Amino acid sequence: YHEDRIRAKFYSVYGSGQRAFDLFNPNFKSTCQRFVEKYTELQKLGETDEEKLFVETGKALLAEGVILRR
Amino acid sequence: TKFSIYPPIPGEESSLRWAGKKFEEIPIAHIKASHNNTQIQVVSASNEPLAFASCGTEGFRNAKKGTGIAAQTAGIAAAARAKQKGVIHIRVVVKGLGPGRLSAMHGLIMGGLEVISITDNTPIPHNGCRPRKARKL
Amino acid sequence: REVLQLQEEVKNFITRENLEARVEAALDSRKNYNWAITREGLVVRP
Amino acid sequence: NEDLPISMENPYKEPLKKCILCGKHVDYKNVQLLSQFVSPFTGCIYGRHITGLCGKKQKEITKAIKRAQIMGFMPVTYKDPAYLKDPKVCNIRYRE
Amino acid sequence: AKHLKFIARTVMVQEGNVESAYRTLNRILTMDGLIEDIKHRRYYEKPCRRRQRESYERCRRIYNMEMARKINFLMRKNRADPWQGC
Amino acid sequence: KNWLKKFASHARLRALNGLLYKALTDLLCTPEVSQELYDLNVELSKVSLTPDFSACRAYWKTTLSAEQNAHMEAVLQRSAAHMRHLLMSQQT
Amino acid sequence: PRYELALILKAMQRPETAATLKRTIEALMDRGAIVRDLENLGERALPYRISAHSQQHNRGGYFLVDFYAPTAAVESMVEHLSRDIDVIRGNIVKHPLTQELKECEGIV
Amino acid sequence: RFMEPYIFGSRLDHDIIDLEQTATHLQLALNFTAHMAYRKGIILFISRNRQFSYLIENMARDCGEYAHTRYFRGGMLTNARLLFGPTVRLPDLIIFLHT
RNA sequence: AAACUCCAGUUGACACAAAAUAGACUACGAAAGUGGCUUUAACAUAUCUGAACACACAAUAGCUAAGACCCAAACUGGGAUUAGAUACCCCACUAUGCUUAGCCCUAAACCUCAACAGUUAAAUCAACAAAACUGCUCGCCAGAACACUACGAGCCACAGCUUAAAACUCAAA
């Protein structure tokens, strides 16, 4: 899928989230998944340049209050 | 200070001394451990032969030369003849894979000399002369 | 670009005119080609 | 349907592993580097199972060592004692 | 011959433990392949025999490593029976 | 030669005995076979070849401890094939 | 092409070393060479004893002469390096910089 | 190989079964089973997965049908006359939870 | 036991010989072959197939001249051996293995797979070897033995190498 690319960058940049996956919950949302949704919303409501989208998504998540250690 | 397995080098100064002398001044015991005979020669650092003893010189004859006991006797004889010339510490240089490779060093130690280093100098050609054909026994 | 680089480099070549000066300068100089590599792939210069 | 998979190269593909000397130039004059791949006690060149180098760089190191040895830059029968305290990169232990 | 002496194949004795030094030298010579070279150089090995021996040794190493890998992989399954009785 | 398939599938006698005894002692003098075996310092008494040359019996001196004897026995049976290969490779 | 001459010279005093270096470079130019640089690696103990010109050497001075010469000069120069009595060992190789540093993607 | 037409794809080296096809296949299988049960046919469940032997035997007992979750001896079906009796009735339908 | 004692050990000087480790690599070359270092030349063909004989090459052994000679070694001597010894172990030393210029042209010269192009659907498929085939071309084969033979012909070969039958005989091979 398209988001896989984003996911890869996330898992290479911010690493695997300290929070544990819960695959029993049908509607679980990982930190990477929240990152992907914010990335897609920013893409659809703005321009398309991968790096600015990445940094802006990081800024927006930190604004919401999600910890992201590089 | 951590013990160094590697020998000292003549250039770089080192604090290792044996009876006040440095490494490159200790006498050298050259052991040749052949298949049928063993020969021990003690020389000084400046290559002065001090003592010599082989299994044939200690009375052992024919197949009895190539045994551990004979090499031990040769080592003891060389150790005595070198002790009579002021040798205590020695550097052992062994050559060959005969039965007396280690028995000579037992004899040398049992004769009173102290071994401070063991060196192997067995001739290993990088494919020079052609060896003989395998025996068809 | 290569020709221009060669042009700039030729000015420092040894010639029969500057043989003495360059020889003495070399005798008053030392270069080291030795360097080591770590398990992590990092160069360790002397 | 917009939810169907699309064709692309594996984005999670981990980059291929590289040897410690990948991208670096091996000179026959750099005796310090070449001495890291020979036996301290015999000077024998270590194989790739010990050095961990790739085949290309293993060949480069071998040719450089032989060239240095025959041109009078490196000893053959042992490793130069000046390089005995250099970093250890070879997977071998004599328990010395 | 032309090399400095007491550097190659040289081991220092610690606390007079000559036996340990000799055994360490033996280990060094064995793991560097010098002992095998000396033993093999007593008699001439014909080139075809040498080639066959090297091929056999290489393929034996490969086969043994593969079998060991298979056994280690299937050893994870060896445990107490979780569905005993059924 | 499909190695994967292969692996998947008297006066003379006295001289041979003496030669094999010397060769086996020489092999045991070093870690050439294995470091573990080298540690145990196994000593051989004699080597006897069967009259049909079907097996080589190497008589090794036993110690007084029983656990040491058992360990030596185990390593020896585990290393016999390697000794045979080494002996045949050295062209003894 | 571009060549590097590795020179192991006798362990001499400064004037003799300078004269020998001048003689070597003059021979190079006489054979048609354009010398780029003369580089000193230092005086050091040889890795082994070298017997040259009926004299045994344990130490020597290491020098590097980078130059451009015709393909025919090399052999001729080698002959000259065989006759000079102050050179322990002279060897001409293709300059290492000319070889291309091919890039690698890693172990397959 | 013969499972390929039923595979939606491979997700990071793990095959995924196409559930749209599974729905139709299950519909046909369940319809066949129901029709055979309506006709009073003998149904024998079979499975060698030891984790589910108890569950499958309980299910077979509950629905009034038969189960064989144990070691399958040679000749249960092709030699039933010698092994059960000359007038034994063989199953009319066999259901594999593990093939 | 013979042999050497102009012997043996350390040290120093010192090949027309063959090339530890790397190489657990699997590369170059038409094959044969090629694994010490440097340098110079240098690895044909923008369809494919295309020869016992045409044109160029061919491991090891062997033969001409010259040369070198550490080690190894057919033969040749000597030492030790039962009861017809050990052909086999030991010592000494030849042709030969090496170089230069010519011959000879044979190998389990084998991946025992003829060269190019294509396919993996079939029934996969006598057996084994090495999964089964298709298209196209050249070479070769039609029971065994006689016979890697005789004769003819050709060849730096003079017994050699290539090509290669027939008569009698058998029911098999």
Ligand code: FES
């Ligand atoms: S892996 Fe790239 S040079 Fe070795």
Ligand SMILES: [K+]
């Ligand atoms: K073959």
Ligand SMILES: [Mg+2]
């Ligand atoms: Mg053609």
Ligand SMILES: [Mg+2]
């Ligand atoms: Mg024809």
Ligand SMILES: [Mg+2]
């Ligand atoms: Mg030929």
Ligand SMILES: [Mg+2]
């Ligand atoms: Mg010849």
Ligand SMILES: [Mg+2]
């Ligand atoms: Mg001769």
Ligand SMILES: [Mg+2]
């Ligand atoms: Mg020959």
Ligand SMILES: [Mg+2]
């Ligand atoms: Mg053809």
Ligand SMILES: [Mg+2]
């Ligand atoms: Mg004929």
